[PDB]
């Protein structure tokens, strides 16, 4: 009855949110799916939290899919007890990771000229940056 949340670690590269959802659905319903992803590029941190509809089925998947030799990786599927589960442990689950291209956004910033006053503010800021080192040396 109580939702059964599965910590799946050591995830082979490619076994991502969509792929986990199809595979884990065969065992039982997956209310929502959350995989840890990198700060900037959103690359998998190789562990996901899969809460099933019930603890019972999640226990079955944890037993069946523990130490699974997948793509040369031993899969770790543990039922995490609810006591360590927190409110935002499944935050943004089943929500696409829109990787914001920070680097190109600043490149667009670089391409975007400052307002003439704000550009002069930069030039003075560079002049501040020039005189800040002035007493620094």
């Amino acid at each position: 009855k109580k939702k059964g949340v599965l910590y799946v670690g050591r995830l082979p590269h490619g076994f991502y949110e969509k792929q986990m959802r199809m595979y884990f659905s065969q065992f039982g319903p997956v209310l929502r799916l959350r995989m840890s992803r990198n700060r900037k590029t959103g690359s998998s941190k190789h562990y996901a939290f899969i809460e099933f509809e019930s603890l019972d089925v999640a226990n079955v998947v944890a037993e069946t899919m523990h130490n699974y030799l997948l793509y040369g990786k031993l899969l770790q599927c543990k039922v995490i007890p609810e006591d360590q589960v927190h409110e935002n442990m499944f935050k943004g689950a089943d929500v696409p990771f829109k990787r914001i291209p920070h680097a190109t956004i600043a490149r667009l910033q670089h391409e975007k000229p400052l307002s003439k006053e704000k550009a002069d503010k930069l030039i003075t800021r560079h002049n501040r940056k020039l005189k800040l080192k002035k007493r620094k040396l």
């Binding site: 490149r107 391409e111 550009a119 030039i123 020039l130 040396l137």
Partner: protein, 247 residues
């Protein structure tokens, strides 16, 4: 001069070296010839790179930055035996410790444990131009993030005197990986080299910089500073007429 008729070279290099030397304050089994690197940072008015080009820039300079006692690893195309014979008769065996074929690099080194083991074994990784596009894969972030970027050394014809000229060229020339930014840092040398060489190593870098990386040359250059890993970024030259250039 050079950049904007105000580049104060020579004196800046001597002042920086003296400043670094002023900041001086068992290990006999933990000692080597390591010298703190000299760091040249360049500021550009625009992002020079569109994306990370994971190949070094062969900035030619006759004052080597990598010590000649360093161990070098050659990554060559198949067959491995031919180039193993080539290094044997050319007398580079002492200099180039290992020659690795591409197939053997893709097979025998697949785990990151093996990749890091290989990376620590050698100091500089020389690679044939014929196969350098592969090395992005097979090597991964264990190399292209921990300051180990293979160098495209031109060995296609494969001759004894050609190997010597490229290895010497690779050893002497400083290297840098281009990335999308308006700022980047260049290796000029170490504290051991005298100030005159650093100033002349530096000027060789800017003229190469103005030619092959910065499209508009000194016009697009914002500022030039000289730094050491723990020292102050002493400005070699600042743009005196950048106000209307960015306007």
């Amino acid at each position: 001069e050079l950049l904007g008729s105000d580049a104060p070279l020579e004196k800046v290099c001597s002042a920086l070296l003296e400043y670094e030397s002023k900041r001086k304050s068992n290990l006999l089994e933990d000692e080597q010839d390591d010298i703190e690197p000299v760091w040249l940072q360049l500021a550009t008015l625009k992002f020079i790179g569109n994306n990370r080009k994971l190949i070094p820039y062969k900035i030619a300079i006759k004052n080597p930055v990598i010590p000649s006692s360093s161990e070098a690893c050659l990554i060559v195309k198949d067959p491995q035996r031919v180039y193993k014979d080539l290094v044997n008769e050319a007398g580079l065996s002492k200099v180039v410790t290992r020659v690795i074929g591409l197939s053997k690099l893709k097979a025998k080194w697949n785990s990151y444990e093996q990749k890091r083991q290989l990376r620590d074994q050698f100091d500089i990784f020389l690679a044939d131009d014929r196969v350098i596009p592969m090395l992005p894969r097979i090597l991964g972030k264990t190399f292209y993030q921990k300051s180990k970027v293979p160098v495209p050394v031109k060995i296609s014809k494969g001759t004894a005197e050609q190997l010597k000229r490229e290895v010497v060229s690779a050893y002497g020339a400083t290297y840098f990986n281009s990335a999308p930014c308006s700022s980047f840092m260049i290796k000029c040398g170490h504290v051991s080299n005298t100030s005159t060489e650093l100033a002349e190593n530096v000027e060789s870098i800017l003229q190469f910089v103005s030619k092959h990386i910065v499209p508009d040359g000194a016009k697009g250059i914002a500022s030039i500073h000289l730094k050491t890993s723990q020292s102050i970024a002493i400005p070699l030259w600042n743009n005196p007429n950048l106000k209307e250039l960015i306007a």
